[PDB]
Design a protein around this ligand. Structure first.
Ligand SMILES: COc1c(N2C[C@@H]3CCCN[C@@H]3C2)c(F)cc2c(=O)c(C(=O)O)cn(C3CC3)c12
Ligand SMILES: COc1c(N2C[C@@H]3CCCN[C@@H]3C2)c(F)cc2c(=O)c(C(=O)O)cn(C3CC3)c12
Ligand SMILES: [Mg+2]
Ligand SMILES: [Mg+2]
Ligand SMILES: [Mg+2]
Ligand SMILES: [Mg+2]
Lengths: 487, 245, 487, 247
DNA sequence: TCATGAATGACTATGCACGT
DNA sequence: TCATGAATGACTATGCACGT
């Protein structure tokens, strides 16, 4: 029996827990804004072909595929993570197209795994765009059977767009969601002004990213908290729902709430007000009725007494309920395997850097493949010029090894190229078929030269990021939901 | 008029209308379906009571055991009327009781169990036409450009598909025609536009003609006597298709 | 609103339920002895490649695949069905190779889906043998997306081997498991004496199938019940566990129970003995101790009082506990979509019929494919005989169609053969490869001759079933477990 | 000294042993229902008892005492050990002289260990001081040789070593089935658990030692306490050097 | 004291037939 | 009354950090 001191054990074990939680579970990678479970689910769905170009697959298959290959944890909590990514009131830009009952903003829970189907959304397809062209580092999974991505290409700034909330050890993150078009403008400026320092860059980006854009709409009151979050990495953003005063035929007045601030449970909100009236604390209120439906959306009617002022009761609601509540912004994300609190310019810059890395790596991969194709084509072209000899050579060979060794000597060709000649179909010997090989070589060499030019010119690389992102924003960008007002 | 909860079952999502005459109770199979139904309903006139699991066979089970059953209590308490001799239709809290189960065979089975409960404990609800059966959709035709259509049978699916194609409409051969294998697979909108919107919903009103003939049939199908049920099935299953010909 | 009478609704709905439960759920198909969920799990694992030639896949993947493609029901009960097929105390011949905690014969439950892995067993591979050679009818699944098998090839008599218990509507099945070697002998006799009438066949098969062989070993007392089951389709078979009296050093005697009858929960059994002493109904018993372990198996020690006779206490145990308990055999299975109670000769015959159907269908499929391959090979040989001419023709063609149309003209060829020539690689123009094509034609024509011979001779067909089954039994057959004793 | 074991006033989840002698008795505190179920099957029921713990154990450093005592898992531990807590601690009433904490080799198992050790150090410290607390080291790998008996490895290094030696010895492994990797106790069956963590002739146990009580107290309060700031600075200070604690 | 969300599944009740 | 076995998922408690 080996002895171990309790201090050594405690320190070693808890640090090991704290670190993996920080860098491997609870906090988003700055580059794609994803936690490991999110990334593994999406790639699992992606690799399984559960894409918007095909019908929704049973969500159990996505969970099972994630479990068996990438995420060595329980099916239940994995399904919860998948579900959340399909809720329009949770994610500003849903990554999962959910079919069935995925719950509500209230206490209505999502249906069980068996009842729901799911597939990736178009934007999630941009998260994974060209992941198979060595655009991101892959590592072996939890048992080494297969490979998994360390990070996704993330061809749109998902961290800032969808935000992130996470409780780790010793620290936590709480990044709000933002409008894609505004983020795009910030990225476009960052690309054009690639030499601008942090001071200038922060000023530019803050001018374009006016503030967070919550999926639940509502209101942002004030500007200081937003500024603090972007300049410090921490700030308190005051959120409000929308209230519209209605009058009655009798002359009675009622407050109609049609929006609530981000992450306010609708049923808890109604129950809170109810409890805050049944025993006083919100006098002036006469009746609370939830006239909500799938067709009219949120609609909480607050009938008030004749001897009551509308704004007084509204101000009381702001004070004593989550009709007005603040978002505790804390811009914490993993950067190069280290947790870091980031300014807005840093968040933009780190993402732009990732995009450039993606585009260069993609270009490198395409350039390598282009050369391989060109290499073999050159081999075929040589065979065609001496086709009479090549065929006679192969025919007179007792084996294919003899033929291959001969081809190498005949045409002064590599073994890979000679292998391609041998694998050539009789189809490819037709007049027009011989011609396409020639043209294809001419086609590729132009492509090779183009790719080389891209790698040689940072300007083109930045231009590609801009143009490709612009295409995404034009297609998948939407209007602002949260309205920003002054004090 | 009767008070709605805002002393009733915890699972009950009651309506807002205080008038039973205008009120409706959707007795739903499963938490999922009941959950989405609660969202797609008209909260003014429509209440939801989800039932979980197979309902207890009141024909087989002893009386006291039935009264212990949480799901039966939920129904009896929600309907407001008593049971058997203590039944009072004056306390009926919903003049429309819609049973909504899956189109599959287990949904059919649950219907027979619920109908058995009603016929044995609260027969006047059937006699006075307060009991209805919702017919869920089976297919959803998702046209590329046109609004989606719902089909409640294989024949209707074939017909609507034919008409649409003839009219020049087109469908994806991947997404295509979504087939519903249960209410639980539907979202709030789909349920509203097929089973709960009073302007398009397909309800069937349960009528009771011969009480004595109904009584013996219930006793045969639901009773403890297996032999009688066995011979009845082997005798009549052969001709189940030809009941409405 | 349409009116419907309650009698109409009740009768239609309940009959529809009863018939689906009877034919689609609770009761086994006579040909493979499988219920729908079993068949769908197994084929799901099979198609997914979860076979013995690969490591165990996470069981969640088997559940999800079954659920998503074939079985429109819940993940939980499906997992339970998969688990049961992996338990050596449930199935006489397990069809699932389980890895992890799959529970015990006692009250110890199986581990959750997340913790376990699973793959098909070798015998289960015999259930599915050559299913991809059109040996069984396939139908569209529950949404028509894919095809599923109506029945498995079942190359060993699985219904009798593993048995079946099922509660339907208006009826229930309870077929006990049997010894594979004994079933094989019956099948062999049925094959040899293929014209024997039912009386002779029942006599012959009853002589070879000595009785049920339970995975839990134990004892069968008497012969009447077994005979009744085989002759009538209904019978009460008395089972017993194994008791071994031990005399202690100090002087006390104790009963050691090392085996229990089929489907007797160990923990319930101990609890039953205990509780019938707590009240006081099994006097003579002094102490109950469960010395069972993973290494010695079941071992329940019942120390008895000194003024007590061991045989008396054992007989009291037989009467008042499940140490002695009866198996209510009811040989009910689905035959041609109809529920039927079957004699033992009928069960064997129906299985043999299914095997002959499988082999004939397999032969037909192989003959069709063999003809196609030969058809193309005949084309290839013609090309080789006139090889110089073939190439020159393809060269001068503006398209491949002109080259094709010419090949038809040159060698009098189909479009398939000419297309096959077109798809030919230069690899096969080497000497040995040309000879390989020649020999391959000779080989197929020889195989075609063999295949034609099989179809024309029932004798060979019966021979195939016998020999193939014999190979399976020699490899996967085991000793008898349940001992048969007289009164 | 002897005490009665439950057989048809102790926790329902407890699978007690048969031996009434605490000096010879052992309590395996197991992470999870699955693992606890397998342990219950692979154990030696004579001397080894199983108490499965479900979910993360409540932090007795953060939570107030009344809430800790209402926690079902803590109650199970306190009741199973038989000893009281704090001032009412009486080692004479200890029902097991070996308390084996058996958690997953993974990160969450380590976390549970610290929570259990926190409970013990705060409520029942003498159990640690007197060497009644042990840590079981689960296997990580199972090498399945084609013809030879399978081997277990408790580290990546040992896996590499046994693989090399076996191959050098002429043995062979399937490159498909091959080396099974355990991701937790729940993935193991009864036999595997016996032959790696419960067989006293093969198991790898670590005995928890307590040297400096004052230093331990401080470390416990820092890592487990309510003060986040102290914990954050400690982690950022010392996580850099965790690899080099035993070099 | 409550919410967040990514981690660490057993229990609970019925239908159905048949034999104790 | 209980066991059999395929059918019809929500509720329950902790860690972790942070803000009202
Ligand atoms: C049995 O642990 C859990 C509890 N219980 C823990 C407590 C102590 C024992 C008595 N019950 C309470 C509630 C719970 F309430 C929820 C979950 C849960 O959701 C979950 C998951 O995969 O999502 C996994 N587990 C298990 C991995 C431990 C849960
Ligand atoms: C809520 O229904 C279930 C119960 N409850 C039903 C009762 C009424 C309400 C209060 N609870 C009791 C127990 C249960 F105990 C077990 C299961 C179950 O195992 C299961 C499965 O897929 O395996 C599926 N379901 C659901 C699909 C119906 C179960
Ligand atoms: Mg959970
Ligand atoms: Mg259903
Ligand atoms: Mg279940
Ligand atoms: Mg673990």
């Amino acid at each position: 029996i080996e002895p171990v001191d309790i201090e050594q054990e405690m320190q070693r074990s808890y640090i090991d827990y704290a670190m993996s939680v920080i860098v491997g579970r609870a906090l988003p990678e700055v580059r794609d804004g994803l936690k490991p479970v999110h990334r593994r689910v999406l790639y699992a769905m992606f690799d399984s072909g559960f894409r918007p170009d095909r019908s929704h697959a049973k969500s159990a298959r996505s969970v099972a595929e994630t479990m068996g290959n990438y995420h060595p944890h329980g099916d239940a909590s994995i399904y919860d993570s998948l579900v959340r990514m399909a809720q329009p009131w949770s994610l500003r830009y849903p990554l999962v197209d959910g079919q069935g009952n995925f719950g509500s903003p209230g206490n209505d829970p999502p249906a069980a795994m068996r009842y729901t189907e799911a597939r990736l959304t178009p934007l999630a397809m941009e998260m994974l765009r060209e992941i198979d062209e060595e655009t991101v580092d892959f590592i072996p999974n939890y048992d080494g059977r297969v490979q998994e991505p360390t990070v996704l290409p993330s061809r749109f700034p998902n961290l800032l767009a969808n935000g992130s909330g996470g409780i780790a050890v010793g620290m936590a993150t709480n990044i709000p969601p933002h409008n894609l078009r505004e983020l795009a403008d910030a990225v476009f400026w960052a690309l054009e002004n690639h030499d601008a320092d942090e001071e200038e860059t922060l000023a530019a980006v803050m001018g374009r990213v006016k503030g967070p854009d919550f999926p639940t709409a509502g209101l942002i009151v004030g500007s200081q908290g937003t500024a603090d979050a972007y300049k410090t990495g921490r700030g308190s953003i005051r959120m409000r729902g929308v209230v519209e005063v209605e009058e009655d035929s009798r002359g009675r007045t009622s407050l109609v709430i049609t929006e609530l601030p981000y992450q306010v449970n609708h049923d808890n909100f109604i129950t809170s007000i109810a409890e805050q009236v049944r025993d006083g604390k919100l006098a002036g209120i006469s009746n609370i009725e939830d006239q909500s439906s799938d067709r009219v959306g949120l609609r909480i009617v607050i009938e008030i007494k004749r001897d009551a002022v509308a704004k007084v009761v509204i101000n009381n609601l702001y004070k004593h309920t989550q009709l007005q509540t603040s978002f505790g912004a804390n811009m914490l994300a993993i950067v190069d395997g280290v947790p870091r609190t980031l300014r807005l310019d840093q968040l933009i810059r780190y993402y732009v850097d990732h995009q450039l890395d993606v585009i260069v790596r993609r270009t490198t991969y395409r350039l390598r493949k282009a050369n391989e194709r060109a290499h073999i084509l050159r081999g075929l072209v040589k065979a065609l010029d001496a086709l009479d000899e090549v065929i006679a050579l192969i025919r007179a060979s007792e084996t294919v090894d003899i033929a291959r060794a001969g081809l190498i000597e005949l045409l002064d060709i590599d073994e890979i190229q000679a292998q391609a000649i041998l694998d050539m179909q009789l189809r490819r010997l037709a007049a027009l078929e011989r011609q396409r090989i020639i043209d294809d070589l001419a086609k590729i060499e132009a492509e090779i030269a183009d790719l080389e030019d891209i790698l040689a010119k940072p300007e083109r690389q930045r231009g590609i990021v801009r143009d490709e992102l612009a295409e995404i924003v034009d297609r998948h960008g939407d209007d602002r939901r949260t309205r920003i007002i002054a004090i | 008029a009767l008070v709605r909860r805002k002393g009733l079952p915890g699972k009950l999502a009651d309506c807002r209308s205080t008038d039973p005459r205008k009120s409706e109770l959707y007795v739903v199979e499963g938490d999922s379906a009941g959950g989405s139904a609660k969202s797609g309903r008209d909260s003014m006139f429509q209440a939801i009571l989800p039932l979980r699991g197979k309902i207890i066979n009141v024909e087989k089970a002893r009386i006291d055991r039935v009264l212990k059953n949480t799901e039966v209590q939920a129904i009896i308490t929600a309907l407001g009327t008593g049971i058997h001799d203590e039944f009072d239709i004056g306390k009926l809290r919903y003049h429309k009781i819609v049973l909504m189960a899956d189109a599959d065979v287990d949904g059919q089975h649950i219907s027979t169990l619920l109908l058995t409960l009603l016929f044995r404990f609260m027969r006047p609800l059937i006699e006075n036409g307060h009991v209805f059966l919702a017919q869920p959709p089976l297919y959803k035709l998702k046209w590329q450009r046109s609004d989606p259509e719902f089909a409640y049978s294989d024949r209707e699916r074939d017909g609507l598909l034919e008409a649409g194609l003839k009219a020049g409409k087109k469908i994806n051969k991947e997404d295509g025609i979504q087939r519903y294998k249960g209410l639980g697979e539907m979202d709030a909108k789909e349920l509203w536009e097929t089973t709960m919107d009073p302007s398009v919903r397909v309800l069937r009103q349960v009528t009771l003609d011969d009480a004595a003939a109904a009584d013996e049939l219930f006793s045969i199908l639901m009773g403890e006597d297996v032999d009688a049920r066995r011979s009845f099935i082997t005798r009549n299953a052969k001709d189940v298709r030809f009941l409405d010909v």
